[PDB]
Design a protein around this ligand. Sequence first.
Ligand SMILES: Cc1ccc(NC2CNC2)cc1C(=O)N[C@H](C)c1cccc(-c2ccc(CN3CCCC3)s2)c1
Ligand SMILES: [Zn+2]
Length: 316
Amino acid sequence: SEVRTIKVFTTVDNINLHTQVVDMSMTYGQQFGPTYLDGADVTKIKPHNSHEGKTFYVLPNDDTLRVEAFEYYHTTDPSFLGRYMSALNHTKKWKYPQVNGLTSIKWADNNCYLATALLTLQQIELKFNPPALQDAYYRARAGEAANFCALILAYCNKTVGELGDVRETMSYLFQHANLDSCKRVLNVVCKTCGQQQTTLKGVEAVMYMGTLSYEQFKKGVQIPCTCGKQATKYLVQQESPFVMMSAPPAQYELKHGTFTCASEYTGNYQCGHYKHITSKETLYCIDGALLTKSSEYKGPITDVFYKENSYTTTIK
Ligand SMILES: Cc1ccc(NC2CNC2)cc1C(=O)N[C@H](C)c1cccc(-c2ccc(CN3CCCC3)s2)c1
Ligand SMILES: [Zn+2]
């Protein structure tokens, strides 16, 4: 038979493109290893004339790509590149409407927790350590959210169609954000035991589970103690751009102006539906691509986010 070839671009960051020549006789997988075009596996697909000049994602098999990859993704896990493409292949087919001047996702493949988290990430000051996340986030804010949503799944070890905890997802995204400066000082007072001051840095400094009221946390909350008597934990000092207050879903009333945004969760554990309530001039319930407006909001709320700079307690 006759030998035909085409010119294609190979890359791992879609930033450093390496020109390559492909034998139309052979498949992409035989000569490049796992290969993906727009997140679609082409490892067992022979090249087409239309493919010439197009960009193709490949697995790092030489040291140039090993580096370029780690520098972009900040991970050296081999499976990560495949999972990002696997995901992206689906997330490029979602619809991302501007809802209340924020990018959102039309409900599909249980994307409700992702929509919420994304609507959330557009309202708080997050500086992303991996370029991949930065580049995608910016392109998300503009409305092309496919790549972002796809990196979130990849970094959270989740697959399209599977429902996720909004809090477990933010925990993960904060692992990959610059929150080193953030500081939290907690005093815990037990009448028998005495006092104990705790300082938390990074992700632990902006996430609390067991109370949704930033107000109640400052006042102090009841927690069990070693001696069996109850103890009071209150916020001494918060140095962060925001704080995340989480609790198991329960009836809560968000008043306009007291919070930045909230995750409402209706349904049983691991099978419920998520809505995003954002506080602006009035209250805005962003539920996938749908939108309702109230002055107040009574619903089961598991996550509430508040903006912050530096807070010092006046107690004692
Ligand atoms: C959606 C989801 C996905 C995955 C996971 N996986 C584990 C976390 N890492 C692995 C968790 C959840 C979850 O469901 N979270 C909600 C907020 C949540 C988290 C914790 C507990 C609950 C509830 C227990 C009983 C409920 C019914 N309630 C709702 C209102 C009144 C009765 S909801 C709900
Ligand atoms: Zn005690």
